[model samples]
Target: SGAIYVGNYRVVNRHLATHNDWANLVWEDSSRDLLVSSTTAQGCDTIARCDCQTGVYYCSSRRKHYPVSFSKPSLIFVEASEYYPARYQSHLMLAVGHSEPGDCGGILRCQHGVVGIVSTGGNGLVGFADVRDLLWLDE
Candidate 1:
């Protein structure tokens, strides 16, 4: 996961939830260097899931696509039961692109087989229990 600017807040996550449930706001990267759960001793406990089932960018239906994929879990098949089939670049395009709400969860095709997930939520929500870090083309 990297840095995604959800409006003025620079959210650092490669994925975003279709609906609002996860942390609502991961680590805000803009002015505040506050990591999720900074006050808590447990630290960030994001439970993200990459369905990689079907799973975008430009907000013009021109999303990211990959025919094949690989994850560290070998045959790890994430079940997007909580949220819909979302794209990896979920809210990143909210401020600029005409992103449509459709695909909720899918696959990320991480060539490196590294299934590391880091989620940050705010607005009264918490944890990455349902963070989808994959892709599903918009087109």
Candidate 2:
């Protein structure tokens, strides 16, 4: 037998005031390549919606639905836990271009508008952190 943290530690994940992958917020522009990587963050105040103009991102497919408007169409992976093996959920935004492991925090834009942040990606498949789900928390 050993010690157990049932009540306090168990609910910590839900109590923490952190941003999730799909939070309803604006984004900026960032770079990926080394030369073009010289780019910077460009302010885009509007958030992308699933049924909005240039609505190429948040469309549904054979497996699941997500903001899928990227060149490679790579499924974004989200981590829901720290202690356990984080399950992969296809509920995040997508972007074109490859992301270095260190580029996880880069910004993602579309049509000169803020969409999401680069979570992780490769092979011209960049996963972004959407802000649609965080409207309630956006204070």
Candidate 3:
């Protein structure tokens, strides 16, 4: 566990107060890779490829959907969790990239602009050329 202290003073009494609190935040270990778990709503797990040497992470959540956008280049792997209706299948993918400017804040406060969608092999693949263009040949 971690902790931090904050101090404030009352103007009327000229009294100071120091407050301490425990932090629930956790840090990622650089030596280990992160894995995506299956959602309760949908029974699908995703495998992510992390290149520690290059500081890049790639994830493919659904066979129907391709990898999502890249994340900020960091030595740590951030954990992602969510909650929603259990009836529909919900999935998430994480990628590695440079962090955008003006995008720093507390946990879960960052923003990821839309990158592109994963392409389906059949007729559903009409407007997904962008995704096909970025697929790794060796993958």
Candidate 4:
């Protein structure tokens, strides 16, 4: 019942099927952008799922634990993982280390609710876009 196109790019509501499906890239629409789609396991029923508070949350990539080192009204930061060196002063909710081969568009969780999604990353800094705006779009 969902998934559509934005300026010629396809947006889907499904999980990453293969390692080569880097649909996470080519995300040009900054507003109302969900690039790919959150998997069933990563999907949320309501905007209430995201508390938007500061704390340690789980990363969708490997279910890894990451702490929100800094939090703002519209953005949050997760500490870099011990596995790699972080160049950014604070890892945006996207979380640590070099992004894996196919890590973008992953989810960030707080008490089983998705608060953010992996959107961009460098060596140690991963960028996440807050989900509040995307959660209410279907209505």
The lDDT leader among the candidates is 4
Clashing pairs in 3: 66-118, 71-95
RMSD for all candidates, in order, please: 16.0, 15.6, 20.3, 9.0
Per-residue lDDT tens digits for candidate 1, residues 108-130, read 22333222222322232111212
Candidate 2 lDDT, 1-139, residue by residue in tens: 0010111110011112124311421222112110001113242245443332223232111222234455333334444533224545343555564454444434344554444444545576656545433332223
lDDT of 4 by residue, 1-139 (tens): 1233323233432232233225344433323234443232333333324445554433455656566642533433333444223333222344454455246555455654555555455676655555544433333
Q: Where does candidate 4 clash, by residue pair? A: none
TM-score of each: 0.19, 0.39, 0.16, 0.43
For candidate 3, the TM-score is 0.16
lDDT of 2: 0.35
Worst 10 residues of 2 by lDDT: 1-10
27-110, model 3: which lDDT tens digit per residue?
211122111111123222122233211111111222122223333332332233221122211121234322221111101111
Q: If ranked by TM-score, best first, what sequence of candidates would result?
A: 4, 2, 1, 3
Candidate 3: misplaced stretches above 4 Å?
1-30, 34-61, 77-139
Model 3: residue 9 alpha-carbon error in angstroms: 62
**Candidate-wise lDDT, in order:** 0.26, 0.35, 0.19, 0.43
Off by over 4 Å in 2: 1-68, 71-86, 111-113, 137-139
